[PDB]
Amino acid sequence: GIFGAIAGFIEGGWTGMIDGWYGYHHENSQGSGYAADRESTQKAIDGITNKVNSIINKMNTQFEAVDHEFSNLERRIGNLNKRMEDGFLDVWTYNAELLVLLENERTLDLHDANVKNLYEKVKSQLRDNANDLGNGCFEFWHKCDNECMESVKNGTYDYPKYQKESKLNRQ
Amino acid sequence: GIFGAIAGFIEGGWTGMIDGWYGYHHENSQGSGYAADRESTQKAIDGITNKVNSIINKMNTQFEAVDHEFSNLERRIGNLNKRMEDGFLDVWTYNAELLVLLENERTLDLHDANVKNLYEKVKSQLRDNANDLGNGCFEFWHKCDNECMESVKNGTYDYPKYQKESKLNRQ
Amino acid sequence: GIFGAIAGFIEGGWTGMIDGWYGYHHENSQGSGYAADRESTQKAIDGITNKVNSIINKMNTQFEAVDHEFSNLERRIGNLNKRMEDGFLDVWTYNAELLVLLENERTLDLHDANVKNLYEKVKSQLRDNANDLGNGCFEFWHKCDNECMESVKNGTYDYPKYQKESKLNRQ
Amino acid sequence: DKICIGYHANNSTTQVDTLLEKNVTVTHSVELLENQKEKRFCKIMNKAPLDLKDCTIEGWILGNPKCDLLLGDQSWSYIVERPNAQNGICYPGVLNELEELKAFIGSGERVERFEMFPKSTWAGVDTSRGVTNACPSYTIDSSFYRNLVWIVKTDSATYPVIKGTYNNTGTQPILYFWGVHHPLDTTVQDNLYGSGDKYVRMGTESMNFAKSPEIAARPAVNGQRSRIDYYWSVLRPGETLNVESNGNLIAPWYAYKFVSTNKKGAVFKSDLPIENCDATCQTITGVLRTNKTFQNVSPLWIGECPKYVKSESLRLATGLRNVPQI
Amino acid sequence: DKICIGYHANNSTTQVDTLLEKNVTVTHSVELLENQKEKRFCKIMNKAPLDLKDCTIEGWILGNPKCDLLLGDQSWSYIVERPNAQNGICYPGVLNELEELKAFIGSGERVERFEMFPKSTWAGVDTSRGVTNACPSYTIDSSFYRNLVWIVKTDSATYPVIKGTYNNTGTQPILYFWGVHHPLDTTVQDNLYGSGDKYVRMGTESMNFAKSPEIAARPAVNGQRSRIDYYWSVLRPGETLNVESNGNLIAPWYAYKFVSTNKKGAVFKSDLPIENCDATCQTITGVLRTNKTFQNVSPLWIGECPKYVKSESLRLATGLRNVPQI
Amino acid sequence: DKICIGYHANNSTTQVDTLLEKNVTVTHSVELLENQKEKRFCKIMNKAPLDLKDCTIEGWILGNPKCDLLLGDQSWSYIVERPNAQNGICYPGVLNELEELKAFIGSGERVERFEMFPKSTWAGVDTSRGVTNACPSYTIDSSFYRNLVWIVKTDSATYPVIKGTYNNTGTQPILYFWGVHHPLDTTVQDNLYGSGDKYVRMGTESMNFAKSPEIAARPAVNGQRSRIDYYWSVLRPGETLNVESNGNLIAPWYAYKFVSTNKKGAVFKSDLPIENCDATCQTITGVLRTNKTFQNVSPLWIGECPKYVKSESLRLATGLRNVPQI
Ligand SMILES: *[C@@H]1O[C@H](CO)[C@@H](O[C@@H]2O[C@H](CO)[C@@H](O[C@@H]3O[C@H](CO[C@H]4O[C@H](CO)[C@@H](O)[C@H](O)[C@@H]4O)[C@@H](O)[C@H](O[C@H]4O[C@H](CO)[C@@H](O)[C@H](O)[C@@H]4O)[C@@H]3O)[C@H](O)[C@H]2NC(C)=O)[C@H](O[C@H]2O[C@@H](C)[C@@H](O)[C@@H](O)[C@@H]2O)[C@H]1NC(C)=O
Ligand SMILES: *[C@@H]1O[C@H](CO)[C@@H](O[C@@H]2O[C@H](CO)[C@@H](O[C@@H]3O[C@H](CO[C@H]4O[C@H](CO)[C@@H](O)[C@H](O)[C@@H]4O)[C@@H](O)[C@H](O[C@H]4O[C@H](CO)[C@@H](O)[C@H](O)[C@@H]4O)[C@@H]3O)[C@H](O)[C@H]2NC(C)=O)[C@H](O[C@H]2O[C@@H](C)[C@@H](O)[C@@H](O)[C@@H]2O)[C@H]1NC(C)=O
Ligand SMILES: *[C@@H]1O[C@H](CO)[C@@H](O[C@@H]2O[C@H](CO)[C@@H](O[C@@H]3O[C@H](CO[C@H]4O[C@H](CO)[C@@H](O)[C@H](O)[C@@H]4O)[C@@H](O)[C@H](O[C@H]4O[C@H](CO)[C@@H](O)[C@H](O)[C@@H]4O)[C@@H]3O)[C@H](O)[C@H]2NC(C)=O)[C@H](O[C@H]2O[C@@H](C)[C@@H](O)[C@@H](O)[C@@H]2O)[C@H]1NC(C)=O
Ligand SMILES: *[C@@H]1O[C@H](CO)[C@@H](O)[C@H](O)[C@H]1NC(C)=O
Ligand SMILES: *[C@@H]1O[C@H](CO)[C@@H](O)[C@H](O)[C@H]1NC(C)=O
Ligand SMILES: *[C@@H]1O[C@H](CO)[C@@H](O)[C@H](O)[C@H]1NC(C)=O
Ligand SMILES: *[C@@H]1O[C@H](CO)[C@@H](O)[C@H](O)[C@H]1NC(C)=O
Ligand SMILES: *[C@@H]1O[C@H](CO)[C@@H](O)[C@H](O)[C@H]1NC(C)=O
Ligand SMILES: *[C@@H]1O[C@H](CO)[C@@H](O)[C@H](O)[C@H]1NC(C)=O
Ligand SMILES: *[C@@H]1O[C@H](CO)[C@@H](O)[C@H](O)[C@H]1NC(C)=O
Ligand SMILES: *[C@@H]1O[C@H](CO)[C@@H](O)[C@H](O)[C@H]1NC(C)=O
Ligand SMILES: *[C@@H]1O[C@H](CO)[C@@H](O)[C@H](O)[C@H]1NC(C)=O
Ligand SMILES: *[C@@H]1O[C@H](CO)[C@@H](O)[C@H](O)[C@H]1NC(C)=O
Ligand SMILES: *[C@@H]1O[C@H](CO)[C@@H](O)[C@H](O)[C@H]1NC(C)=O
Ligand SMILES: *[C@@H]1O[C@H](CO)[C@@H](O)[C@H](O)[C@H]1NC(C)=O
């Protein structure tokens, strides 16, 4: 995809992570588990919901065909009505089908970007205190307990705190 | 946002930088200041201006309703005219409102990407001669005077020139 | 551009690479040459072809004007037909011209992203076994023969194999 | 010790198309289009439709003797006319501006039938013998329209100038009908109306009407080579109608107080059953009970309906590309 | 020593909506839609509109005696007709193909009035007594249309065949009018036109017209139970009109050289004031002075106007998400 | 030792526009719009068009004596009418519901001419002298329409009631024509039809027609101050026509079995040559031979054509921004 994450450098999704669209899987001495990133997921839910509702609202008018009849000597106005009604039917069918194809492409890209940005946000915090495996996973050069893990996930990871310990194991 | 810079890893904008959309803030012995990146800003102004003018040009036709009257025995053609006029009014209202929502989303993304790309362009020049603070700021491992600063801004920064000095301070 | 690669940190294209949209140029003891990345190129050809065919399919209806005549006492319905026919002509002209401008912008961005993602994919494999020159080129810290080159291109490059040799030359 | 960044996958097999790619499986999506219908007619806004059954629109408001089931007051949310309905214009002839009449009736929600011109209106003529075997009732072989009076001359006497007037003092417009008889030959002409140039003339503040009989033989229809020219008009509130004729007049007898709807009007020509049920959206081919934005059922409807398109499906992705492992 | 990359912020509180997010504050934006109007009528291309004031279109081109202010030559960029205008068809009757006549007049920019048939045209009849209390002037109680002549028989004499002809040798089409009188009874018929079957017949290279009087009493309007059938037509350049009648003719007297516009035509029905001002875009509800692309004022206009939509606002972002610190 | 990532460039100078940028050179692109045409008419679905040449539509189906080249059976994929065609309605008069007649004929693909009423049909009258110098053949100065019979009285005798009937027992509708003669004066009226009130009355199961002559002098056209009112109708399968007249009848003689097309119908008014060639898409201004999606040639066409737009070009980028070095 466009941002290279979904079905990209992160080859597949997690059926194990059921409570959000994007998130984390950690492993430490206390074991392993899945956790959704609540902020990025909710932000995406709000955006996508807004998109759907906006499309619904813009599509909220109707063209109305009539039951009116035309006589044998009214072929021209009868045909005028038919071509008009068919005309708007073709316009709106086009508008609906084209929009769906376009927005589906962009919606999937949006998800792709959000995963990529989440990955970058973690990379940025950890720096050289961890090793990037290239598949969205990071191996710590230090022991990272549950609160250390949670600090990574909520954006408050303390790089200086683990720097020296990481440097020693790295070297 | 989609590219992660605006209201992203760069949390906020600069009211201090009044002469461009994207740019720099530097600090050295001679003090500190804001400067717009003229090239990226102008390129964006040209693009966005072109987009606005293109939308205006495509919207440059008008459907025209008429003042024509219809008698009591012309209910069908009278109603035909009304549904037609209402029909085009609904189509164009849709076209205008949907386009504005779509383009506003993409325009903001464009700005987001340009900031991200500007950040990358600086990161690429500086390499390990500077420390990336994660907020769009770089701390030099060497003294960088006004001409050094300006070389970073105009893309001609000399990495080898400051390499040895940076290496020593880094280590 | 939006992803910063095409006419970006990779300043220009290769007339030398004639068999694909994206790819590689290598140099080693056995000489130098161009090679297309077949997977990313084909994936893009499939996508773009699908886009063109989808646009063609959505544009596959026609509004039909008629040869019908109207008398001197049929000015109103005659004018109704004209404004209707002109109305749909304006709608479809708008739809076609706007779509082409929009999709051309996005198609070029798609190519830009694919080049960027290809670059990232190589950067990720090589790590510090090579030096990034900032122009899409990587200089190996080790000898990389034809099969090493091909392993980089097909995603199976062996970082541990060349690690020690690269480390020594790097230091 | 490890942490990984990743994304949701599930067991979804639901797919969407994009400009770049067809058949993409996604974790979540929403279908915007409705393709299901209940094949029946229901009430709209708690108001039942009018089933014309074996009568056509003409048979109904003209008062064809076999349409007595419909006769009188009616209220409707819409009209259902059956395709093979047999009871229309029984005595052969053209109902003028028929399509406009249907459009008018369709724009209404109620008619109240009343006697506009009692037979006493027409002084020197016979109002009791205007029946024909072309227009049978269910019980008698020769009858006539309940809203019209076929006037003929009294025995041997001449057919005099007859006059009638009606002042609409009410607040509602009045839909009424009348006719001009065209006999197949001068013999029938003299037998029924006597001799001399005949005319039918009518007028209001805004309308003039004048017609004379045109004697000729047309192919037999329902046993008749003669014809009637039927007409309709609308007497506005405050307007007065004047009728004047010296013969060949099919006179207005009963008419309708007409109540025009502020909503959309509909006339559905269908064989579908009307059942005891409610609906907010009624199409000519059935009821739509849906929250969806689009529908591919029918462009013809009354009530609040989704937008009609030709599409089979309009599914939006909301979730992401579904890539479950394994 | 530091360098940072960043983006512009300012004091803007102006917001836009996107598909993903509503109420987004941006540093720069442009409003594409115009919602302001000047509530008045101005000149279009330095040409003033025609105010019909207390006269309707019919009163004007028929020459209703109370419309003398309008009488004669007129040039206009568009027409303003006032809603409560009282001076129309004074002597009761229908002006046939009225809607088409309005559409035709609307397609013009100028009429030149001239005498098409001087009263001398009609030999054996009286052209001096055709007045009625239904059509008063401002100074006299009984008058008539300035463009028509109500012809009656001379004292006691019979009403003969009268004839008239006009050959349009000019380069412009001619808009003209005529009528057929329908008396309420045979007494008035004989008093005015004598006895015998009456006709009005007219023709050109491309038109035939024939009508006879239809005697009957209609509800009184402006004191009259009689009626006139008014007619109009257009005599093309090079065409000739022949008039022939033995009675009941409301004759053409004055007509108009008609100049058709190459621009759009307009007839605005409004109470808005016409002032001394210029405009490039004039809608039925007011002037638009704007550089904007869209407008939500009115779909009805003349001149160069923005596209009409129902939208309240169409604001495009040009700058970026405004995130000022603090 | 080096490896670089990069992208394709070539010698393309072909450009596209985007929302952000005009005149962008791209390595690959596809033009969606067709602006080329063959300026000629070809066959559509192996079926040739009908060239009316020097005859108009009226001249053709009325049977103007100078249109004998067209006379009889015709099959067509579409109709070409030439702008300066001279042979139309030769004896002056109006063909009623002309525009509807053209729309009807346009909806057809074939007519079969047959004798509907042989001259023997009309008993007491003369069918041999109905010719006029207004309607010359190519060989004789005075002729008449091949599909009509101008009936006049026999020497000195009165003009009696004539009658005719035709029962359409076939499966195809029948297009037929008739007329009513209006002499310039009572002298011609008496000379041709004798004295007394004259009528023309016709009828079917679904149609009534009645007209009487209207005597008056109109400006001379093709030497005639008299007129004919021409009429047309369609006799449905199973319907019967009855004709009855005591004078002034231009009688139906030959008529057409009418075959209606299921495709789109077209009547192209053009000077373009019809050649020996095939096409799948034929516009009024020429043939389109293209695989393209849009065209800016013409909105008027028959066959399978690209969508018409006003655009000069609709080029989609498929490849990428072309940035060749050097
Ligand atoms: C992002 O995620 C991190 C990790 O989970 C979270 O930080 C933890 O927050 C909790 C609760 O605020 C902290 O628990 C308290 O810890 C203090 C500090 O003493 C201990 O921690 C230090 C390390 O900083 C050790 O060196 C010491 O030896 C101690 O083990 C402790 O005093 C306190 O106990 C008092 O308060 C209790 C309240 O229930 C009371 O019951 C008790 O009797 C005591 O009076 C808590 O036990 C935990 O230490 C934090 N971990 C770290 C590594 O800092 C972030 O949330 C908070 O972060 C802290 C730093 C504050 O800034 C709060 O305002 C944050 O809300 C979380 N951030 C976000 C934004 O979600
Ligand atoms: C991107 O931004 C950089 C930084 O501002 C800019 O480079 C500077 O450009 C200016 C003007 O071209 C240079 O000023 C001249 O410097 C030379 C060199 O001597 C001094 O610099 C070197 C470092 O390279 C020191 O080691 C020496 O000790 C000196 O201090 C100097 O000879 C010259 O003086 C002559 O010319 C004067 C003209 O007014 C004249 O008055 C005087 O009497 C002398 O005859 C200038 O003073 C400055 O040195 C550059 N700085 C650096 C670090 O290189 C880039 O613009 C130019 O860059 C140089 C390298 C050239 O390639 C020009 O073509 C560029 O235009 C700027 N680039 C872009 C693209 O915007
Ligand atoms: C991505 O690109 C790489 C590089 O081109 C490619 O890997 C090469 O694949 C070829 C063919 O599969 C290998 O050639 C065989 O090599 C074996 C191994 O011995 C030699 O290689 C090792 C290094 O691994 C050296 O240390 C030794 O000293 C040897 O030089 C060799 O036994 C074999 O010879 C037998 O098979 C011949 C079949 O024709 C037969 O003729 C002969 O008599 C022998 O019985 C081949 O010569 C080559 O070594 C690979 N290079 C490397 C660096 O691994 C990838 O394709 C394959 O990769 C290997 C590792 C397997 O996993 C295959 O399944 C892959 O298809 C390519 N990958 C993709 C996905 O395109
Ligand atoms: C998917 O799994 C859920 C349980 O999480 C199950 O209830 C549902 O039936 C499954 N649906 C499909 C389509 O596999
Ligand atoms: C993909 O779409 C095609 C349409 O050609 C359909 O036949 C097929 O069922 C789809 N494939 C799936 C659902 O795996
Ligand atoms: C018309 O022809 C059919 C078929 O022969 C016949 O049954 C019918 O009686 C005829 N009707 C008339 C009115 O001639
Ligand atoms: C009806 O529409 C709502 C709108 O959000 C949707 O969420 C809901 O699932 C739909 N109802 C059913 C029963 O599917
Ligand atoms: C914004 O600030 C400018 C000064 O830069 C001032 O002139 C203007 O009034 C302010 N506008 C708003 C809307 O705050
Ligand atoms: C956001 O838009 C809402 C519309 O519901 C409006 O009421 C409100 O003023 C806006 N909020 C602002 C301008 O802060
Ligand atoms: C109609 O009735 C009203 C109300 O009584 C009356 O004032 C008016 O004179 C009547 N007009 C006619 C023509 O009968
Ligand atoms: C009118 O439109 C121009 C078009 O660019 C715009 O720049 C200008 O600000 C507008 N004029 C005013 C007075 O706002
Ligand atoms: C481009 O180069 C090809 C050879 O690769 C040549 O055949 C062709 O004529 C050239 N076209 C243009 C437009 O330069
Ligand atoms: C760019 O487009 C312009 C349109 O104004 C055209 O005149 C010119 O030829 C184009 N430039 C090229 C093809 O280099
Ligand atoms: C009409 O006037 C022209 C120009 O003088 C003349 O040639 C022509 O004969 C006239 N025709 C009639 C019918 O008066
Ligand atoms: C006609 O259209 C096809 C559709 O793919 C296209 O590939 C081909 O190049 C076109 N033919 C010619 C001769 O250009």
Author numbering:
A (entry chain B), B (entry chain B), C (entry chain B): 1 to 171
D (entry chain A), E (entry chain A), F (entry chain A): 1 to 326
What's written in the study?
Receptor-binding specificity of HA is a key determinant for viral host range. HA molecules of human viruses preferentially bind to α(2,6)-linked receptors, those of avian viruses to α(2,3)-linked receptors, while those of swine viruses to both. Two H6 HA proteins, one from each group, were chosen for structural and functional investigation: A/chicken/Guangdong/S1311/2010(H6N6) (GD H6) in Group I and A/Taiwan/2/2013(H6N1) (TW H6) in Group II.
We found that the HA protein from the human-infecting A/Taiwan/2/2013(H6N1) virus, TW H6 HA, already possesses slight preference for human receptors, thus may act as an intermediate towards a complete human adaptation. The overall structures of GD and TW H6 HAs are very similar, where the root-mean-square deviation (RMSD) for all Cα atoms is at 0.67 Å. Furthermore, TW H6 HA appears to use a novel combination of HA1 N137, V190 and S228 to overcome the requirement for a hydrophobic residue at HA1 226 of H2 and H3 HAs when binding to human-like receptors.
